[model samples]
Target: HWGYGKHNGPEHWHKDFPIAKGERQSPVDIDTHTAKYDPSLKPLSVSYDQATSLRILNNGHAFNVEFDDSQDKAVLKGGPLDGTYRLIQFHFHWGSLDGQGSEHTVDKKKYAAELHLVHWNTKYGDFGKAVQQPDGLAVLGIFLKVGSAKPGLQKVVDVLDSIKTKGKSADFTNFDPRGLLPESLDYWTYPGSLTTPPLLECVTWIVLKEPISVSSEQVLKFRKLNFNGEGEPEELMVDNWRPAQPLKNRQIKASFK
Candidate 1:
């Protein structure tokens, strides 16, 4: 199992998962000046049923809010997607320090944190099958900046105390993830892989241009989490983001000018 430690971290990931060094890896630095605008890109269509939220679990990597995606209850369409992508779960990545946690950067500048809303194409039938194909997944990347406390995010933060250790889970529902999104649907799109291993190169990355705000104190709470389960050596869960990979020859398309 790979982690963000000295020995089993991102740098050593390719040793076991060869696809980590694949051509289309994720967490790339987005340069707005270089990104080409595409008029053909449709406005993002997001519909979520708050009741479909299932549970919140700390999988040792990050706290994920799982959704009931058996139907098209919460689906993402348009905005660079060929077909509907069903929302499975959403998680976050952050660093121990402020202003340096996000996986992807804009013009090489880091943000306080990053949120990943994982989705799989319905055309592939299931998440397992979708992940193996070329157009299987789509991840929405939202950057979080340090500022005033965001009430919309408090729902998620309030449960962190219960899941402070790994493998712990609590009943969480009625949370609409749409509240976490920015005002603008404008974003940049590119083909990339998962930031974590089994780094599958099947994602159509839709990164929002604008960022949401979170207080400094609120983000530090993420560090209080323990990577190990209860009774194990306590290792603070911080700096769980992967470093930005090379962009190679892929083109970054923008939904707005």
Candidate 2:
């Protein structure tokens, strides 16, 4: 029932999900000057298996590209993380226009969109249990700017036609999401929560400093995705991003000096 609508949006989420106003929530504004440089942080070790990519689904809130996490086929390690975190799925948060969309900000400047590569700690046995642990999840937040189109992203855009409505899904095999990553893995690390419902305070946020590019046309195509099912009234899925939350007493550390 909760959605990005006037009567049921982010502002109204706290009523149903009280933890929405919890201490360590996500999509925080990154004040560059305030981010202390931590020399101890290591470069992220990313190895993604192309064959593990499963399907693309319109989950009402966002379009998610699910992956096969049965094994450590696609994983992320090191860099502010302990043990290995397996790729669970990847989704995005965007606005209706190029001027907005991104949930995280750099010194108050917002990007056109943001990509979240969600992962869960393999040590926890499964994602369901992992979501309950404090350090159970790691979300790679990649900011997206409207510019030239990325070939890797184009592959995903092509499938938008197949999954135009909520609950719709289509095969999205052999897709390596690593191609969509920026050249630099330099990022800001902090403890946070999922930016959606449940608002579980179990994520270690790894937000990239350098943003990738996506053409305006590509963003427009993403907007075509509908929140409503096949028979319901059309509701375009845009501005499905949770605005930046309070930092509280949390300290944000940067990988680069």
Candidate 2 residue-wise lDDT, 69-178, digit = tens: 99989899999998799998999999898999999999999999999999999999899999999999999999999999988998899999899998899999889898
Off by over 4 Å in 1: none
lDDT per residue for candidate 1 within 127-172, as digits (tens), equals: 9999998899999999999998878898999889999988999999
Record all residue pairs in model 1 with backbone atoms less than 3 Å apart, i.e. clashing: none
Number of colliding residue pairs in each model = 0, 1
Deviation in angstroms for 166 in model 2? Answer: 1.0
Estimate the overall C-alpha local distance difference test score of candidate 2: 0.92
C-alpha positional error of residue 185 in candidate 2 after TM-score superposition, expressed in Å: 0.7
**Segments in model 2 whose C-alpha atoms lie over 4 Å from true places:** none
What TM-score does candidate 2 get on C-alpha atoms? Answer: 0.98
Clash count, predicted structure 1:
0
lDDT score of model 1?
0.92
